[PDB]
Structure 1
Amino acid sequence: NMTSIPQGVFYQPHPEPIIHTERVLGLSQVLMINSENVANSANLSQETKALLTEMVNEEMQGLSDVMIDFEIPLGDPRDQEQYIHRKCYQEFAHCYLVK
C-alpha cells in the first residue's frame, strides 16, 4: 500500500501541552518558625527540647548555607500591621505582670 502525503508536509505527535501567557502575578510570604510554641503543646521534657533545638538548627543552617540573598523591590516587611500583630503574639502573648 502506497499513500501520497499531501502538499509535502508530514506530522508527528507532540505530547507537551501549550499555554499562552497572560498577566504574571507574584506574591511574597514570610514564614516564622518558633520552637517554644511547638514545645508547649507537646508537653515536651527539658532534655528533649535540648535535642529538638539542635535538630532544628542543623536543618536551618543547611538550608541557609546553600542559598544566597536577593532583593525584592516591594519594601520593608517591618512596617506591615499584620506582621506587627503576629510578631507580638508569637513570643509575648501569654506574659502578664501582677502587683
Structure 2
Amino acid sequence: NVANSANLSQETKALLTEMVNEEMQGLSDVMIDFEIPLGDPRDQEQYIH
C-alpha cells in the first residue's frame, strides 16, 4: 500500500522492505506469542480443535 501510494521504482521498494522487516523483527524479539482465553476451561471441543 505504501509503495503504491508513493512512486517507488523497483529499487527503492527493496530499501523500504528492509526497514519494515528490521523494525518488525526488533518488535517481535520481545513478544512471547501466546493465545487469548475466550471461552470456558471445562470444554474439551475447543482444546481438541
Normalising by structure 1, we get a TM-score of 0.36
Which runs of no fewer than 5 residues in structure 1 stay unpaired?
Answer: 1-36, 85-99
Quote the offset at 1:38 in angstroms.
Answer: 1.0
Give distance in 2, aligned partners of 1:80 and 1:62. 37
Quote the offset at 1:72 in angstroms.
Answer: 0.7
**Are residues 46 and 66 of structure 1, via their aligned partners in 2, closer, same or farther at CA, if it must alter by over 3 Å?**
same
Give distance in 2, aligned partners of 1:72 and 1:61. 22
Quote the offset at 1:74 in angstroms.
Answer: 3.3
Q: Give 2:4's aligned residue.
A: 40
Normalising by structure 2, we get a TM-score of 0.66
- Cα deviation code 1:24-78 (max 9, x no counterpart): xxxxxxxxxxxxx110110112111011001100000000011112221238999
More relative contact order in 1 or in 2 (CA 8 Å, sep 6+)?
1
RMSD between aligned alpha carbons?
Answer: 7.4
Q: Is 1:39–1:49's contact at 8 Å kept on the other side of the alignment?
A: yes
Bigger share in strand? 1
4+ long deviations beyond 4 Å: 75-84
**Are residues 79 and 64 of structure 1, via their aligned partners in 2, closer, same or farther at CA, if it must alter by over 3 Å?**
farther
Which runs of no fewer than 5 residues in structure 2 stay unpaired?
Answer: none
What percentage of residue pairs aligned between the two structures are identical? 100
Bigger Rg, structure 1 or 2: 1
